[PDB]
Symmetry: D2
Subunit: 383 residues, 4 copies
Amino acid sequence: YQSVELPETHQMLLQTCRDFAEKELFPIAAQVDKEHLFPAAQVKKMGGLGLLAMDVPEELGGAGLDYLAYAIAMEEISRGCASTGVIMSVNNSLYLGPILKFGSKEQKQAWVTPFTSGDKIGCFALSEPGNGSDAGAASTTARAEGDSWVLNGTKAWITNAWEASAAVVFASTDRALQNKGISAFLVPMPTPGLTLGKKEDKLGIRGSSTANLIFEDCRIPKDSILGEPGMGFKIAMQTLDMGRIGIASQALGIAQTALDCAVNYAENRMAFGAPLTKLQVIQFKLADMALALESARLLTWRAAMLKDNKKPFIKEAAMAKLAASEAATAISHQAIQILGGMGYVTEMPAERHYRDARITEIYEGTSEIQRLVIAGHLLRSYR
Amino acid sequence: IYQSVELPETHQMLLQTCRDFAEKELFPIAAQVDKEHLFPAAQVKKMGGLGLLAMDVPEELGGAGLDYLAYAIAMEEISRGCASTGVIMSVNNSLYLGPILKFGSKEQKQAWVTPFTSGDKIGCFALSEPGNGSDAGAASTTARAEGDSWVLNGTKAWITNAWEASAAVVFASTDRALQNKGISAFLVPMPTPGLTLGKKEDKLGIRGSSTANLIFEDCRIPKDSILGEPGMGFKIAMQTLDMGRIGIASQALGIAQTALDCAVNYAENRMAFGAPLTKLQVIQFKLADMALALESARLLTWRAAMLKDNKKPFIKEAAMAKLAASEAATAISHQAIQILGGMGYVTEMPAERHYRDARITEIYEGTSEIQRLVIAGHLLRSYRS
Amino acid sequence: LHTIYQSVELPETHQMLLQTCRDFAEKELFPIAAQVDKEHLFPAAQVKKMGGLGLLAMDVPEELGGAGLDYLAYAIAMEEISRGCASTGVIMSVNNSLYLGPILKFGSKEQKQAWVTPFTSGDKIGCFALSEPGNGSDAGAASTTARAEGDSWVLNGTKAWITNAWEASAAVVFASTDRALQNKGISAFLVPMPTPGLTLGKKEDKLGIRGSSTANLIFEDCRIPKDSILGEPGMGFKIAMQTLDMGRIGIASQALGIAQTALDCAVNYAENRMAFGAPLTKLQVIQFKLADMALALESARLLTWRAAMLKDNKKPFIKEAAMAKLAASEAATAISHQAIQILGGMGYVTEMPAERHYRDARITEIYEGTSEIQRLVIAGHLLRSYR
Amino acid sequence: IYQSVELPETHQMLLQTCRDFAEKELFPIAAQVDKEHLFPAAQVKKMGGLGLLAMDVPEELGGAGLDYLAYAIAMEEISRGCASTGVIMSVNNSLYLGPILKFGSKEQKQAWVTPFTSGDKIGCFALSEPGNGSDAGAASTTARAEGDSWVLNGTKAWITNAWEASAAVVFASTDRALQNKGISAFLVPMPTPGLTLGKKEDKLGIRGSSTANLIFEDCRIPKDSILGEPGMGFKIAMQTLDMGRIGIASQALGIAQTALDCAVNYAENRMAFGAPLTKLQVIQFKLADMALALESARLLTWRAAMLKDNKKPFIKEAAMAKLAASEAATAISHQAIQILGGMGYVTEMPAERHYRDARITEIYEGTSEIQRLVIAGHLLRSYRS
Ligand SMILES: Cc1cc2nc3c(=O)[nH]c(=O)nc-3n(C[C@H](O)[C@H](O)[C@H](O)COP(=O)(O)OP(=O)(O)OC[C@H]3O[C@@H](n4cnc5c(N)ncnc54)[C@H](O)[C@@H]3O)c2cc1C
Ligand SMILES: Cc1cc2nc3c(=O)[nH]c(=O)nc-3n(C[C@H](O)[C@H](O)[C@H](O)COP(=O)(O)OP(=O)(O)OC[C@H]3O[C@@H](n4cnc5c(N)ncnc54)[C@H](O)[C@@H]3O)c2cc1C
Ligand SMILES: Cc1cc2nc3c(=O)[nH]c(=O)nc-3n(C[C@H](O)[C@H](O)[C@H](O)COP(=O)(O)OP(=O)(O)OC[C@H]3O[C@@H](n4cnc5c(N)ncnc54)[C@H](O)[C@@H]3O)c2cc1C
Ligand SMILES: Cc1cc2nc3c(=O)[nH]c(=O)nc-3n(C[C@H](O)[C@H](O)[C@H](O)COP(=O)(O)OP(=O)(O)OC[C@H]3O[C@@H](n4cnc5c(N)ncnc54)[C@H](O)[C@@H]3O)c2cc1C
Ligand SMILES: OC[C@H]1O[C@@H](c2ccc(Cl)c(Cc3ccc(O[C@H]4CCOC4)cc3)c2)[C@H](O)[C@@H](O)[C@@H]1O
């Protein structure tokens, strides 16, 4: 259930991840951001704990957990480091997720199992320079020739691009079929015909890598296709439905640690004779931050539990992602404000939380796309 | 319409029963109840027969033996039908029966609970006074012991069901020098010598409910009319409001849900620039924000109910739910008017009523500002723990 | 005319006009506002007194019986009057901007003498019939028609939502003279009330501005003289739009009055209500609400005065009038909502005026183009500016 | 662009001169200034030669002989180009020269204003301390009289231009018993014996300005370094802040404008779903809301500037301008990032920088919370008149 008693596997998992975060991520979070340093040693240890492959079956090397467990772990990890959070989220939902749900027995053996322990991680390449929200406009092409698919085109904004050893790539096998002409492919990295673009210099989550995947006469075997030709758009969308629960959970952790920072500070900063928490406006700020965060967690857990129970969860996932991301930006903004001048400098982690929060309103579907998704499903329920 | 969580089949069936009752008995009368300020007597009687006026009361006392999750679901479905009918039911459940269940004697429960579980008699809750609402502990109505009697003097203000209730849980200071350790709770019959009703308030909304002062002038009641012991009245009132706030949260969910229902149905059939309003992206975004606000507040509300059912602390969670639901009901009913356009402003559509009805949920059983104080205090305590 | 500095200190004539309308509102309007609302009573005697003061024809030349003032003066007066009574404000705003406005701007000298002059003294007022039951936000979709027949036009169709419908003696009516031309096939017509062919619909029962009448005008083969057309055929769409640009300044000013009187009520109440041992104004949350109310009100007024002065200075003001109407209308609802909240229980009942101010404010977000329409207007003109 | 009712020809030409300077000298360096946290010395010197560092300063003292309306327009156009350059400029104008001009002697103006009007030397303003920024009056840095000199002890905090300034206006307590009324203001050369600079702060934004503590240890200055009489320090600080808040409001206007500039050009040239972004209703509504927030905040700002120019009271008005402009800058820069999508999160575009620069305007020269307190105080005092 929801806060109303968690199962004890999930409660133990919560404490496990919270212990890992505070011991292994809190002391490195500031350096990862300032040095834009990929946290390889921390990622490997998380692999050992099963956090990089949580809903993956144990026979494939995964933890055998569920998406409520994933959501809890994503929050605790992201509370400690937002970049570490997104690295983990991409491996779980966006890379392993579609291969589990749509892959061959042999594709799972070759592409899931070597990516469950933290020695290798994957990435997800849907967006392109000309189109992100308009995912169905993918114009990277895949052409069948001989025993190969031949890939040509640029994918953009690919998280883990510089550290991953495989990608789920969406390319159009016939642009005239529009979002029925997209297919999904498993692409090893590195590979001939594939070049990495320059790393993006980002506002936040600076410990993750983000770079273009440039395909030029890139040949991969025919059986690299995930599913059948034309399934790619559905594969991408059902993958993002799961991924959005991950990003919602990341935002929950950014929000929680920004709120932790503000409460501790306000309890010890003195003004006009008393701690800041004696001022009414400060109490109201804290109350509204706690309300935004706790209700967005309820939405997140609802989406996660619907998925686990094999129920439709597209609208609920979108709601959780929208609510958590906007709450993470509003809470991190008010945490800066509560710190005052100290909110604006590196002596405190509030300015970093604000920068990290801002991305959760953009990737895996902007807040605008989330609102469209919610409207679409709301109206169908009334029909 | 929401697809949320794992409902027990008992509560799934209760939702359908209540929704069917509301659509069949409440929807046709909501406009008349509001426009004519008409207490919906026949429907309250019928709800009483169903167990809706005494949901959390044990069956051996005449109640339905349900839980507070069931109460929240019923309150939403009923208030969706009629916002006045909702509050009337919520007062009887949380604010009148609730404290007597939790603090009464055996003799008090069989005398003051059981006859108020079927819809032939309802009660009310009298804490606020003209000089003080939010500052509840400033109650200056007095109760003085004399002979075999308590003697009550003073005016309670804003009492919902004042003109239809047959009993009241009244809070009065047995010694004002003790401040909010000087309040006591009393069971008072209505009517009774020494008690006069003030004129009914002319309200913005919830027009079906009566609201009026209770004016005590040398009003004598039996010595054993006291609920609890002298001086625990303040805590009786606060623990009662903690439970009532889940009711008002659920009332706000109903208003919000029926305002959204109204907006969707209208936007699907109103044509503009060649097509239904639901083809306009701006209208889609309004509806999505309304659905999110509503479904968010319901999860908060259900959490507080389920927490109380599991005997866990729930003061902070009850206040969050009441706060979120009430501000959502005002926001959603505002945007439902807006989606209807000119028709949103006229009495032959229900949207302007929902907006008037919503507004009260931000005020009573503790204003939004009090809820934020309550939330902040408990949040801070949790961090010091 | 109008220096930039006059937005910061009014010309003495405008400062005098403010005090004069405020005195009038508090003496004549404050005592009756609640009655006008609860009884849905057209305030005929007060509109007459305002007509004698020039407030019903502020922009009208003195030569034609008007006050000979400008739109800055009109906005100041609309605020003070609406602070007294929101209904009286709208009634005054329709006559100034929506009825007289288009006739001064697009009429011949003959038409002004016949249709402006008898409507400048408060004995007759006008109205503006653009909306129809099937279309309020797209003016251009007028299905009411006007067909030429000899020395007459013949009007057929139902206009909807007409403020002053049950009290006006003339209407500016928009009708399609060429359906095929859509947007360029609309024309504007001066119509007498009563007149054969015209039936009034039932009055609408509304949330607020209850003192004003709102009803359909039903035209069934209704004939009017040929020179009733305002401008030339096809100009109706431009006339409606340019009229609504002026009218939006009037509605912004009405919203300012509703907001100001709601804020007046909240300050007086919070200063004299105690809680937890001190006035409400000692509570930090209350101070913040009041400050937020004042900011929203004062910036919306600066937007409104800007639009008025631009119009007075013969500059474009479509975007600026839309910003003013949008800002002031949303400020009126937010401020009136927070005034209720500051009053607590008293904010929900008729003992106090706060709940009425909430209901009155709600209309300003809808009429003369909803807030959504205002944002579309603002966006279109912002993009034109960058091009 | 926006509209204004006729600006004087003076100010129209100033706007164009300042916009030309910003687009030619500041736009090409803005990214480097931010990324390398590099003080824009050559540009500041050029601005000094134009009069921009001493705008409301009499020409006979080396200034431009302009007014605060002109200052607000120049602040906006400069900050539209570089938010760091804007604050460096705003500190010299309002925070350093302002109080010397308003409270200084003929001789103090000659020695402390004139050498700081041409960009060769700039000043700074030291009121905050590590333990108190909002609580102004709680200044624990002391200044004791020692015959014909003053001796200062204590640490001032968060001083912008600290590492580039040749003089500070420093506030220190000359009578700690007198609290609010025992503060004084002092003109301090930089560098000077007894003064040490803290390490530069590493900041979210305006990274081209320097920010550091000023540490006074037995720092001796002549007797006529005091501005005004002993005890006038708190008033000098508050009236200086009233002026500076118009400067920060204008800085925020320029950050807001350049963010909206970037979003409009981007949305007009980015396609999605077969059409430009500006064909989407939600994008149109964002842009309209950004435009409205910016233009109304500028009107509030110009009102405060003109009142000051006309020597009318302007405390509430400056606080409203600063509050509205600063919250607008954050909201507008936020929505600019959103309109750009992925491009809003990276240095390929300048939106992420604008987001970071805007954030400081809600904090310094009085947080939004303090601004609301100032507004509330003067509203109530006006009502009590
Ligand atoms: C740090 C980072 C990491 C990323 N990692 C990945 C990754 O691993 N894999 C991957 O596939 N992608 C990734 N992306 C891409 C990301 O998902 C996109 O940025 C986003 O989904 C699409 O936005 P866009 O950048 O193309 O902007 P655009 O799609 O051009 O959107 C521009 C604006 O239009 C708005 N808009 C409003 N209404 C509509 C409407 N009806 N239709 C369309 N747009 C509308 C959008 O909300 C946005 O404000 C990443 C992006 C970032 C910034
Ligand atoms: C329709 C209706 C029915 C009602 N029914 C009942 C009933 O059946 N039983 C009953 O007992 N009561 C009832 N009430 C009373 C109701 O609960 C009060 O109206 C409410 O608690 C607030 O009290 P007040 O009216 O005294 O406002 P005030 O307490 O005077 O409050 C005024 C303003 O100050 C604010 N404020 C107060 N204290 C603080 C603080 N410490 N910090 C910050 N802000 C503060 C408030 O939030 C509010 O905005 C009813 C009220 C209404 C309107
Ligand atoms: C009290 C009152 C008095 C009135 N008085 C007058 C009068 O004197 N004269 C007169 O001519 N009219 C009058 N009206 C009509 C009024 O101007 C219209 O109500 C209003 O403009 C909206 O039209 P509508 O009611 O048809 O709503 P609709 O146009 O149906 O709009 C419904 C919803 O869709 C939105 N919408 C519509 N078009 C678009 C679009 N393109 N993009 C996005 N959203 C859109 C709207 O904003 C609204 O939320 C009055 C109305 C009222 C309530
Ligand atoms: C980049 C930068 C440059 C600066 N430059 C200068 C400079 O040149 N000169 C200078 O003198 N200072 C300067 N400052 C200091 C700046 O003005 C202060 O940081 C600011 O006024 C807030 O004070 P504080 O940092 O001590 O925060 P605090 O006062 O500790 O504020 C903490 C929080 O409590 C709130 N709060 C405080 N008091 C109250 C109250 N009474 N009621 C309600 N809420 C309250 C605040 O609004 C804030 O949210 C600078 C700061 C920064 C970040
Ligand atoms: O990410 C997805 C997009 O990114 C695009 C992109 C767009 C404009 C520019 Cl100008 C650039 C150059 C650059 C500059 C600076 C860089 O590194 C440091 C140095 C200083 O600060 C940062 C790296 C790259 C790249 C790709 O071209 C596009 O196809 C993708 O849609």
